[PDB]
Amino acid sequence: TPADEAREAAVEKALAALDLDAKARLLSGQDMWTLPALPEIGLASLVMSDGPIGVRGVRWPSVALPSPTALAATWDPGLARRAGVLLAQEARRKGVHVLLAPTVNLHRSPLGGRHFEAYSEDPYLTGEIGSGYVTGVQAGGVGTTVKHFVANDAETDRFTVNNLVSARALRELYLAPFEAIVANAHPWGIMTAYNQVNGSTMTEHRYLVNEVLRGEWGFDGFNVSDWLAARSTTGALTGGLDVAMPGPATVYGEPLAAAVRAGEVTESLLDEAVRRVLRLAARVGILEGAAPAVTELPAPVDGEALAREIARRSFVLVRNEVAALPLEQGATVALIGAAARDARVLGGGSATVFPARVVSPLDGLTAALPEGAPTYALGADPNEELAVADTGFTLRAVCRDASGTVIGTRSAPNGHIQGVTHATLHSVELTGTFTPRETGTHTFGVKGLGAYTLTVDGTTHFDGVRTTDTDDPFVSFFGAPVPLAEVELTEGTPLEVSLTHVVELTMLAFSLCHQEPQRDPDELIAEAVEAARAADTAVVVVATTERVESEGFDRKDLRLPGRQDDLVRAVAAANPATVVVVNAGSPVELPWREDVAAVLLTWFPGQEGGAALAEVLTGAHEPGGRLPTTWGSLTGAPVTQVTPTAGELVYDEGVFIGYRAWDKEDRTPTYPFGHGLGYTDWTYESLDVTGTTATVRVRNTGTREGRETVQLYLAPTTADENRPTRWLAGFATVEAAPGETAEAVVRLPRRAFEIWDETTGAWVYVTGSYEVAAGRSIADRRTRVTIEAPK
């Protein structure tokens, strides 16, 4: 803390200069993304933006990386550090100061909405990756808000739900990754969640925010509310909140200025909170008078290359039978499935961005394979009932005032929408022309809320409203699009399409949606089976959509959308050498494993996914992924409750989530935590533990050079009603050529032996004999040793 002392001196001078009206103003938001500026003290407007896979800015493109679970499947916090560096470069370019990322809530249930956005079901692996990600983002002088503090491991009724979580459960599981990132990475900020934990809402939670996070862990950054989570001027200030950031009319500002002057809300409390915001201002560099934390920035990073590297390093090859992968030299390959032509690179929610261009599996494999590239056949379409209007749509974004007079025309990206306009703007048209690809009944819709008027070819097909009873307006926007009208358009012949939204009195975004005309599912699977029959290997890319996987709501089942499961079985029957490329962000049921030759989980693999998949399938590279979460059937899954009964979600499983819960119940999953295969064999030959330092020698006993994640699992020798049977206590990714041997000196944290004392309010190093085991997964433990926990 050498320059930090000088920096915190400039913060104190700035705090002293400001008056009560400016102090309360600063803590209140200005726009959807930025805070007010104060030239009286040389402070610029703090720009904040989403998020985990890419930086959006203020919608005025981004680099779309693979989903957060994909980054965690690489088991490499050095990759997460590099990922963070690129994101800081993106933020510096888009003028963003704070990145609203990473999400580190655990994978409690497989039905969780933002499951694709979290890293793992294990708090150690989550903390390690999160630590790397934050250190990397802040390495480029860009702030981070570790979201969603704490216990936001489900989306239904997230606005009000009371998540009743145990004392040990919070300390050992849900809070762990936050403590790990606070201590290791030193984050400049945090975000408090919409839900409540044991009574208090996270934004108003005095015990967890001020006493635990700040008091025990020594957090020195700012605490932003989740967008619309701030709901009390006095309740949030006293509960450790600093910034009510939903938008312009926040709970802070003039209501807070008044509460200080009139009520028993002390100006000392306001001063303590502004001090935190002004400390952030100095680190991100928006405050003149305090030098920025990172002055010399990290060397430029190639965004496309890192997106490909993270993508292939995460692909978990769970199944591979005799050797389906990699593909053989000069083999006839057939690509099947809609997800191969139109890939799903991002998951739904605020984490979405628009990349420059996306490489699809068919684009990638066409270039990778020679003359007579993959024979493509769409097997089934998962992206229905509706999808954003893009293919064949040439749209503009017209702004109108009260008199309907045009006051601007922005270029439409495709259908979504959010210049020299202001409170005068009354409505927003989204006109254009649409050339249909095939004749039939085209449906048109919208994903938005409020007043809408649709006119496909002059005729006003819709002119009504779209209200909803839900407690959260964010659930409403990213909900499935609503069909407004069916229309008969002949292919080739285009017509003038138009969708207007009237705006007046938070709510400010809509998108034109369109469904391609009817396609028989059974005939689609018939034409794909002919291609499966006409090939040495069939590659079926199966995927969950942004409508299935998204924020605001939870999934209903782990089954694949559309007739995709029925497509896989038809292809597996016609051709035995079938490779299923699962492009899903969360666990999904694989009922046809026994029939298919191979399975490869690719998550939502970012804009370069198609290039990484082409490299892996052809054998240019190896799939370097190892499950960061336990995959299995929903019936076998022991912790699935996402829905709150009587407005309460009890976490009855306690300290047992993910693999810990499967062990406690005897239920064995389809593929366990840490499972994954590459394109080479690994023989663990030596394990030496000295105190708490495990040293592992592993041999590449395969035909090709490859990577291996060494996974150390601690397990008490005695019975453990109080604890899980085994748990991850360390890991390390090593690379070696065939025959060559690599070592791994992995130190197990002191914490791996400790448990939480609810009464003392302290950690308890559990003494006794343990079994430290090195392996390829939890189920594939290769070598064991018995040690006494050191003093």
Author numbering: 10 to 69, 74 to 335, 340 to 435, 444 to 530, 537 to 822
What are the paper's exact sentences on this?
In Streptomyces scabiei, the causative agent of common scab in root and tuber crops, a genetic compensation phenomenon safeguards the loss of the gene encoding the cello-oligosaccharide hydrolase BglC by awakening the expression of alternative beta-glucosidases. Here, we revealed that the BglC compensating enzyme BcpE2 was the GH3-family beta-glucosidase that displayed the highest reported substrate promiscuity and was able to release the glucose moiety of all tested types of plant-derived heterosides (aryl β-glucosides, monolignol glucosides, cyanogenic glucosides, anthocyanosides, and coumarin heterosides). The exceptional substrate promiscuity of BcpE2 provides microorganisms a versatile tool for scavenging glucose from plant-derived nutrients that widely vary in size and structure. In this work, we reported the structural and biochemical characterization of BcpE2, a GH3-family β-glucosidase of the common scab phytopathogen S. scabiei.
